[PDB]
Structure formats: structure tokens, C-alpha cells
Amino acid sequence: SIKIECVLPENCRCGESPVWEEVSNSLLFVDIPAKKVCRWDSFTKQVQRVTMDAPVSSVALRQSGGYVATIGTKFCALNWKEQSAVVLATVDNDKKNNRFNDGKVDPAGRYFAGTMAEETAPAVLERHQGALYSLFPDHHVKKYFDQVDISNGLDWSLDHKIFYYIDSLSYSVDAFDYDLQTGQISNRRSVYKLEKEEQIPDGMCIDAEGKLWVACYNGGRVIRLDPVTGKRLQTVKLPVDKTTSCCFGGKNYSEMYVTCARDGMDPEGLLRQPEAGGIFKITGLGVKGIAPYSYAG
Amino acid sequence: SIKIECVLPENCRCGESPVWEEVSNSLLFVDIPAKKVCRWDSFTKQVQRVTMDAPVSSVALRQSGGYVATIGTKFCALNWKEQSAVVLATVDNDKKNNRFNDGKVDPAGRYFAGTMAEETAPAVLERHQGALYSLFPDHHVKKYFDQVDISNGLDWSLDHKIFYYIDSLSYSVDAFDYDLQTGQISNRRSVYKLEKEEQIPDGMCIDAEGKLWVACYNGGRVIRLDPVTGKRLQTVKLPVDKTTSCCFGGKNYSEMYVTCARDGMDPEGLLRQPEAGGIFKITGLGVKGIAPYSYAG
Ligand SMILES: [Zn+2]
Ligand SMILES: [Zn+2]
């Protein structure tokens, strides 16, 4: 049996980028259009919040201390206590209107993230403006590929030989060969195409059996896929439609934390999804996840 | 009911710009990379073709006689009985790889056509290189706006107050307010957004109810769109994937003609679509089209 609970009714405009900090039993996440980074202590229940000067799309662990975030079209290191960010690298300078979206650290401590055109407009507009990036330990940047609509969930297989990636308007989870030692990706192929009711695929993580959990935007669900068989294994429905992301955390990585968005709802949807934008905890999935990697620069 | 016929197994590299010439009961079209203007006699069933010296991307009737056509980055007059073009105007002189794409005459005798960067491999690059133009009856070019990808299908509403325009890599059918007397457009807005499955929006033609028909390049289909409600009204699927463009012809515009492309297909997909690059005729739609305008310069 499954328990779904709102642990923190944060009403985020757009909650994203859940990451489990095991050393302090905290969850981090972002609220993208609110430009916030948040850190929620699972023991005290207290949340702290830093507000940045541009959309903050993702946040990850930095092994030397503090955190890394993608703010606007920059990779930045964050000194949480000083409420100070230092710019590590910039991308997409040629684009007048981009941001980072989803990002996540390698098995080798490289901070992967891509971009997208900024939009809340959708159905008056356009595309293919994104590209996938990685920030190496030496603070150098690689562009993997362009023509990306919305850079979204991403992860890596337990044996470090395959990269999983979602570009959301593709409606497909893709897989690449990944070289751990160099961070090269090849042989892009589709491993799962969403069903319609699955709506927009968004955030993703891998679990300790190597299956994939995809948050489904407008979907009110997260879906478990086998990437080696090509099939859906399970659907867990949430009391909110605008599920964005998910990760594993809590004791032994046995709980799932899920982000969602309160933005773009109307009065009558807010009325009966009153916890929209909250953080949900799902217990009793009967699977554990794995620990995130920490940026190496 | 819908009835589909491959009226001509032309195998066009890329067949485009269908135009019904009702005084000879013929369909004019182009084959862009073969650099051919084409004319199929719907009665004898035979196709005549003239070879130009640069890719021909559109053709239109000329009020005073013969044809106009866009050949490379040039608006040309075409006398079909000799077979050479007389340049009337050049655009994009500073872009030494641009070509015109799609073009159609105004309810007022102005030849609209926009350009794109010619592509590779072959072809395919890079990007925002295009602009939208309109040759006036005095042989002077107006320009309109740039950073287009693939200037594609275009038509006018039946009140002559709305210009509809497709830029392919925009996956959006757009509308502008349009002013007959001056050819001025303004208030560009998305009236429709393509679903993953519909692929890339290519040519298009309004019907006598004011709906819009758009050929979905790699969607093997034309979809009929309500500009005012922004919803898809029906899908007509086709024997072949690279449907490029569409127009109304046959007696009083009661039949629809779909062009297609066979360039960019592998040896075994050609063998599943024996009719890639042909001309299809669809009867049974319930609506008629409207006649083409003739160029008044
Ligand atoms: Zn996301
Ligand atoms: Zn076209």
C-alpha cells in the first residue's frame, strides 16, 4: 500500500528540481518563476529560501561545499549562508530569450543541464531553441546537441553506460550510450513514447533496480518505465495535475518526493486541487532510489 | 465519403506549389530540386515540364499572360512557350545560399513569397536566414520581416482582412490583420499549434467556408483548421508521408490536390510507398476552394 501526502504546501508557481541532501536529511527544490531556491529539513520541517535575480531552474550538490544552480543561462555556485552566487559559465549568449531548464550532476560530477526558449505562451510560439550542456570540474562547458524544445528530466543507468533524457515536446524518453570517463554521449534512441493521458513528460529519476520514474505534466501522475523492455510498469496518480518532477529521498532512499506547479491553473481547478504547487511525499512504492551525484568543481 | 487518387505517379524529388489553372483544366506545380515547372493536363493525363537554371519553388498565373515564378532568390516572369525566365526582381542578395520557398498571389494581384537558407546533405541548415516579401504590380518588392526558418504556406480570409502564414520550423499557423488596399499586415498571432504526430506544417489554402487546409510534411496528412476557434476539424490521411502542399481545383474547386516529396527517404520506405513524390486528388470533402489570384504586374 501507497501513502501520498503533501509534506509542504508551498504553493509554488512552478516547483522543480527535487534533490535529496542525505548528509542533513533535507530536500532542495526550486520555484522557477518565483526565482527561489528552497531547502526543506525533513526533521525540523523548516524551509529556508533564497531569491535569485533570474529564473532558477535546477539545483544540485557541490562536493567542495554549498550548492550549484542554473540561474537564467548561467551555471552558478551558491553560498547558501551568504545568499551569494558566483557565475561558473554562461551558454546560449546568442539567444535573446532563453533559460536553463532541467539539470542534474553525472556519475563523474559533471553538472548536465539544458535550455529552452522562455515561454508561457504556448500556442502562440516556438522552438527548438534549446541545447543540452555539461559543466565540467574545470569549470569548462560542452554543448552536446541543439534543436531542443524543453530540456527536461535526465538520469543515468546504474552501471554508468547509458544516459536517459527527455525533451518534453518530443513526448518520448530517449537513451544514449554514455562514456563515464569522458562524458561523451552517442546513438540517441527512443526508449518510451508517452501515451496521450500521460500528457507532457517532465522530470525523471532512476531507481535502485534501474527503472525510470517520469513526472507527467498536466498528467497528475508519475509513471515507472523499464528502459530495457520499452514498457510502462506502473502509474501512481497524485491529487494534483501539474506534477513536474520527482526524486527518491528519506531513509534508505525509500520515499519519493514530487514537485508540482500552481501556475496556469484557473479558479475552479485551484478550488479542488488546493495543494497545487506543494511538495508531495509518496511512501510504500516498494522500491528505493539512489543518491544524487555532487558537482566536482 | 473521401476518395483519394494518385492522379500522377510523378515521383517528384519535392513536388510543391500546386496551382489550378482552370482555363486549360491543368494543375501547375514545381519540383524544387529538379528545378522544374510542371503542368498536368487533367484531361489527357500528360505532364509537360520546363527546366529552369536555379531551383523553382513556386509558380503563379500572370494576369497579362504566361506565368510568374520564384527561381533561386528571384521573382521571374515565365513565358511557357519559349522556356526562359525574365528577371523582374531579386531579394536576399547578401545571402549567398538563400532560395525562395512558398509564394501565392494576393486578392489584389501581389505575389507574396518568402525565402529560407538552402539546405545540406541535402538539404538542411541554418537557420533564421529567411524573410517574407511581396512583389507589387509595379515590380517593386516590399519586405515584411525576417529571422524566418522556412517561409511556407500562405492564404487570405474571404473578407480579405486576414493573412494566414506558415513558418514550418515555427510548428504554428499564424494570423496577421491584413489590409487589402495597401497589402499591409499587423498583429501577428498563433491561430493553431501542430501536435507531435502532425509533424511540420508546410503549404496551405483557405476553403469557401474560411477554414484552412494544411499539409503536414512527414505527417502523411492534410488537417483542416478553424482559424477562429483554433481547433482541428478533420484529418485526411494519405498513402505517402511527405505531403508538402495543397490547393483546390477540378470543376468549381470541388476537389483538392496534394503534392508530396520523395527526397530524404531510404530504399525500403520508397518500396512501402510506391507513390512517393506523386500528385493525389481528394474528392468528397464537402467544401469547395477558391480560384487562384493572377499577378497584376
Ligand atoms: Zn521540468
Ligand atoms: Zn512548401
From Swiss-Prot, chains A, B:
Q: Which residues bind substrate?
A: R99, N101, E119
Q: Which residues bind a divalent metal cation?
A: E16, N152, D202
Query: Which biological process annotations from GO are given for this protein?
Result: intracellular calcium ion homeostasis; positive regulation of ATP-dependent activity; regulation of calcium-mediated signaling
- Enzyme class label: hydrolase
Cofactor dependence is on: Zn(2+); Mn(2+); Ca(2+); Mg(2+)
Which reaction(s) does its UniProt entry say it catalyses? D-glucono-1,5-lactone + H2O = D-gluconate + H(+)
Q: Write down the EC number.
A: 3.1.1.17
Q: Could you name the domain of life of the organism this protein comes from?
A: Eukaryota
- Fetch the Pfam families from UniProt: SGL
Per the record, residues carrying N6-succinyllysine are K142, K242, K251
Which cellular compartments is it found in?
Answer: Cytoplasm
**Cellular component annotations (GO), alphabetically ordered:** cytoplasm; nucleus
Q: Which Gene3D superfamilies match?
A: TolB, C-terminal domain (2.120.10.30)
* Similarity comment: Belongs to the SMP-30/CGR1 family.
Q: What does this protein do?
A: Gluconolactonase with low activity towards other sugar lactones, including gulonolactone and galactonolactone. Can also hydrolyze diisopropyl phosphorofluoridate and phenylacetate (in vitro). Calcium-binding protein. Modulates Ca(2+) signaling, and Ca(2+)-dependent cellular processes and enzyme activities.
Annotated protein name in UniProt: Regucalcin
Q: What's the name of its gene?
A: RGN
